[PDB]
Amino acid sequence: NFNKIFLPTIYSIIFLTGIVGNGLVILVMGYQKKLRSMTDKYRLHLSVADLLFVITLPFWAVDAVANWYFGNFLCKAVHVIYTVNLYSSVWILAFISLDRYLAIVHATNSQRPRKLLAEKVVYVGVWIPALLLTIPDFIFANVSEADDRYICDRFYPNDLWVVVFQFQHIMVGLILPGIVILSCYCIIISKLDEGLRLKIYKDTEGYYTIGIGHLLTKSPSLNAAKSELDKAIGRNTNGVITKDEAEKLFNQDVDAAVRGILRNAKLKPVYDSLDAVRRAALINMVFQMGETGVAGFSLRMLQQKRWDEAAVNLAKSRWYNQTPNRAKRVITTFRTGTWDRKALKTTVILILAFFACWLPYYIGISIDSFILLEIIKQGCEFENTVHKWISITEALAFFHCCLNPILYAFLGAKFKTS
Amino acid sequence: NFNKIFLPTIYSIIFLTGIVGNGLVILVMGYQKKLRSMTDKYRLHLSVADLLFVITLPFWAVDAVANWYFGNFLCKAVHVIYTVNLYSSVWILAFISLDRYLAIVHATNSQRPRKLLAEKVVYVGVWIPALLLTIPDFIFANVSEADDRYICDRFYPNDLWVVVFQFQHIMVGLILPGIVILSCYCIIISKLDEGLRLKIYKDTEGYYTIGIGHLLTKSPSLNAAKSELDKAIGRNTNGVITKDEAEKLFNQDVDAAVRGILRNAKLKPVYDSLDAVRRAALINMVFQMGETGVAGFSLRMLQQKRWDEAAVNLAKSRWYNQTPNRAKRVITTFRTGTWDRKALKTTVILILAFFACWLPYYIGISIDSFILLEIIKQGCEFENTVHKWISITEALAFFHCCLNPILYAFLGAKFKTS
Ligand SMILES: CC1(C)CN2C(CS/C(=N\C3CCCCC3)NC3CCCCC3)=CSC2=N1
Numbered sequence: 150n151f152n153k154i155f156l157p158t159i160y161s162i163i164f165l166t167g168i169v170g171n172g173l174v175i176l177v178m179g180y181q182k183k184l185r186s187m188t189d190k191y192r193l194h195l196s197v198a199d200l201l202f203v204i205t206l207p208f209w210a211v212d213a214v215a216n217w218y219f220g221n222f223l224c225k226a227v228h229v230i231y232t233v234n235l236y237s238s239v240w241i242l243a244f245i246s247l248d249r250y251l252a253i254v255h256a257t258n259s260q261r262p263r264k265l266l267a268e269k270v271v272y273v274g275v276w277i278p279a280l281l282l283t284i285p286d287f288i289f290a291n292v293s294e295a296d297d298r299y300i301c302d303r304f305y306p307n308d309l310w311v312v313v314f315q316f317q318h319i320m321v322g323l324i325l326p327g328i329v330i331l332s333c334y335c336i337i338i339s340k341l342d343e344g345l346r347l348k349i350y351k352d353t354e355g356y357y358t359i360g361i362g363h364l365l366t367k368s369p370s371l372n373a374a375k376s377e378l379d380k381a382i383g384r385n386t387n388g389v390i391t392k393d394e395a396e397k398l399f400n401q402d403v404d405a406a407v408r409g410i411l412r413n414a415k416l417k418p419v420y421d422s423l424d425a426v427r428r429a430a431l432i433n434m435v436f437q438m439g440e441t442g443v444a445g446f447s448l449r450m451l452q453q454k455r456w457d458e459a460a461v462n463l464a465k466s467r468w469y470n471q472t473p474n475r476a477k478r479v480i481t482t483f484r485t486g487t488w489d490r491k492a493l494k495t496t497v498i499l500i501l502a503f504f505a506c507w508l509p510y511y512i513g514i515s516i517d518s519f520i521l522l523e524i525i526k527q528g529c530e531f532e533n534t535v536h537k538w539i540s541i542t543e544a545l546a547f548f549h550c551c552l553n554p555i556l557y558a559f560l561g562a563k564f565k566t567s
Numbered sequence: 568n569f570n571k572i573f574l575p576t577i578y579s580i581i582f583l584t585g586i587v588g589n590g591l592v593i594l595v596m597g598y599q600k601k602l603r604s605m606t607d608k609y610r611l612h613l614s615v616a617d618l619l620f621v622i623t624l625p626f627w628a629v630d631a632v633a634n635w636y637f638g639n640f641l642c643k644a645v646h647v648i649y650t651v652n653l654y655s656s657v658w659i660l661a662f663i664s665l666d667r668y669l670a671i672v673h674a675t676n677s678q679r680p681r682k683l684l685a686e687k688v689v690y691v692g693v694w695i696p697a698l699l700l701t702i703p704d705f706i707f708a709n710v711s712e713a714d715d716r717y718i719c720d721r722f723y724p725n726d727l728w729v730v731v732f733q734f735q736h737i738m739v740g741l742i743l744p745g746i747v748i749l750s751c752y753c754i755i756i757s758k759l760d761e762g763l764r765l766k767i768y769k770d771t772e773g774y775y776t777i778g779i780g781h782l783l784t785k786s787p788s789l790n791a792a793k794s795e796l797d798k799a800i801g802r803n804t805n806g807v808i809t810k811d812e813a814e815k816l817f818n819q820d821v822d823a824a825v826r827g828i829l830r831n832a833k834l835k836p837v838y839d840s841l842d843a844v845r846r847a848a849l850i851n852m853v854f855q856m857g858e859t860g861v862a863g864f865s866l867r868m869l870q871q872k873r874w875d876e877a878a879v880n881l882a883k884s885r886w887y888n889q890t891p892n893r894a895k896r897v898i899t900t901f902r903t904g905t906w907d908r909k910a911l912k913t914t915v916i917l918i919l920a921f922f923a924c925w926l927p928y929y930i931g932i933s934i935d936s937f938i939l940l941e942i943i944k945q946g947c948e949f950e951n952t953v954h955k956w957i958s959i960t961e962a963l964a965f966f967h968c969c970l971n972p973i974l975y976a977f978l979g980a981k982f983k984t985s
Pocket residue numbers: 209212213214227228231300301302303540543
């Protein structure tokens with residue numbers, strides 16, 4: 150009878166650490182609009198989905214120890230809230246995988262629909278279908294007099310319905326979101342202006358070129374051009390070159406054009422004052438215009454460490470109109486950085502921890518599936534202990550509601566003092 | 568007892584019209600490699616999937632009338648083949664929807680993965696998972712002595728398994744492929760070189776422009792440019808213009824530049840000799856180079872109706888290297904046509920007819936679902952007639968195996984004689 154001691158303790162912890170945890174998130178998210186990334190818009194939805202559930206936990210605690218005093222309406226309410234929290238939380242995490250797929254795989258053109266998903270579809274795809282999935286809780290969940298106490302849960306006409314709702318749970322809860330999440334990160338891990346071409350091509354003017362804009366020869370002869378760049382790598386290739394070979398050739402194109410920046414006195418106090426990322430943006434500008442071209446700028450502002458003042462000044466040139474998309478990237482690189490890892494890790498460890506909480510519960514249910522479907526035929530003492538290890542794992546699983554705020558803790562905090 | 572007369576007749580028709588029908592497809596598809604579209608590669612897979620099933624139908628005919636003489640191995644074989652044909656056929660049609668989505672929505676860059684899906688993934692996505700789905704037929708399908716006759720079908724430990732396999736059937740067979748198909752055509756219906764911009768922008772040189780390369784004024788003044796093109800449409804817009812407005816402006820840009828082609832004597836016997844589509848390709852060439860530019864070509868071949876001779880000649884110019892992707896489209900348009908409707912209708916009517924054959928069967932199963940799950944509680948005479956109308960609708964559904972070859976009939980045939 151010790152389930153009165155285990156379960157109400159575990160339920161009390163999640164309600165207390167969840168009301169404070171998820172409570173702070175919703176409160177802080179509303180306090181400011183300036184600092185809001187796409188993942189932070191989704192993590193707010195996750196907080197509302199979890200707060201709504203954590204508040205129903207004291208009812209779960211009382212029901213474990215004593216009785217369902219709350220009535221028939223509140224028996225329907227807690228089950229409905231359990232169905233919303235179950236499918237929404239997992240599907241919001243499926244959208245965070247979808248958002249991460251768009252933010253990295255579509256580097257350039259991404260924010261365009263990333264907002265469409267986060268603010269518009271996030272309801273059509275997550276809130277509207279999850280609330281529709283609660284329909285059986287309204288029909289089936291009911292209070293009934295189990296011997297000596299009022300029992301409250303889903304009661305169906307037959308035991309076949311248990312399977313219709315267990316299969317549906319595995320489908321919408323774990324198999325379908327699991328495919329989406331595992332697809333997104335599978336694309337992310339494997340896949341992680343001037344253009345890259347691994348086979349010989351003619352440029353805007355018809356000269357033989359290969360890799361990131363490297364020029365072989367202005368001679369119209371096919372074989373004479375190949376042999377002029379067969380000796381640049383050190384192999385008989387007949388054109389076609391590897392990705393790492395092109396990276397070395399681009400590095401040789403930079404390493405030779407990067408020496409010229411250090412010799413030209415007009416931009417050398419500008420390039421040196423520039424940190425790494427902004428330093429590379431000027432080199433990206435050099436390959437396009439040339440050392441004399443770029444040194445005619447919008448440069449006295451960039452060296453003085455005046456960021457936004459030089460950025461708007463560069464946008465008042467002809468290079469801004471000649472190459473519109475190609476120039477905007479360069480200008481934004483001076484203002485900020487490599488925005489054309491830590492954020493990817495936070496969501497990866499959030500999704501990995503979400504299925505970690507739910508892993509001991511999955512194992513439990515998987516055993517009953519074999520019990521009802523007659524795969525394992527151990528009597529009644531064994532099944533009595535399988536069920537004894539479902540409620541504990543389900544309670545332990547609920548800790549997932551504390552994963553989202555726990556990852557927001559110690560944000561910007563310097564772990565230095567001892 | 569009339570099911571001996573209805574069912575073996577319906578089974579005999581599908582085996583005879585299927586062996587001839589699907590037989591001819593596989594045979595003809597192999598005879599030539601030249602004429603092969605993406606849909607035709609998928610329709611061959613559909614033919615093999617249906618031929619394999621139609622050959623098992625005489626066994627279905629004998630089993631309806633007399634007995635399962637064939638044995639325990641062949642009872643497992645027919646069920647396995649039924650599972651392959653069920654999920655593969657529907658999922659091949661899901662790939663035809665996916666291929667149609669790539670061929671139309673990605674107009675330019677499509678054939679690239681359209682081949683990846685059709686030849687490489689078509690096995691990983693359709694053949695490999697369908698053959699894995701047959702596993703329960705090997706375990707459950709068995710011959711047993713129903714009173715006075717040998718009955719052969721899936722026998723499980725309990726009636727809960729019927730639900731685990733009915734829900735799985737609806738999921739992999741109809742709900743999941745249905746979402747994919749309905750998604751693809753939903754995108755196709757709604758969504759059905761120089762670039763289109765509905766808001767004022769600066770061109771390569773910094774002059775105010777709007778729509779498909781229409782030039783307002785070289786004056787750097789914002790309001791003076793707007794008012795110069797506020798009078799071109801006849802409304803106070805403050806920049807922003809509609810899609811139909813831009814189409815009228817492009818038509819006014821063409822209608823004025825199309826008059827010039829009819830006045831220049833150098834190309835007027837070329838433009839006039841050119842049919843519609845190839846005529847538009849030359850206009851697309853005019854807006855880029857201008858009436859004097861294009862009239863310097865590669866033109867005496869195009870007017871003489873020598874197609875491929877002019878195409879390779881145009882690819883030997885500087886315009887071919889200056890605008891590589893933009894020129895290749897124009898050259899291909901002279902060789903062939905608008906390749907940058909009838910094919911879309913054939914697949915639409917194939918998918919619509921596929922679910923039409925399966926519609927009376929879906930209705931039948933849907934009633935038993937309510938019977939087992941206790942939604943409708945009509946005794947034993949009603950259910951005896953629901954089952955009496957499942958086998959007929961299942962037999963009538965099998966006609967779907969004759970849909971793929973029937974659509975290949977009368978191809979190129981002139982319906983003129985009477
Ligand atoms: C899936 C589900 C919502 C369903 N369920 C269940 C079955 S109902 C139930 N009471 C509550 C479970 C949580 C929702 C409110 C009813 N049983 C017993 C009754 C005796 C005391 C212990 C719990 C246990 S934990 C759980 N979680």
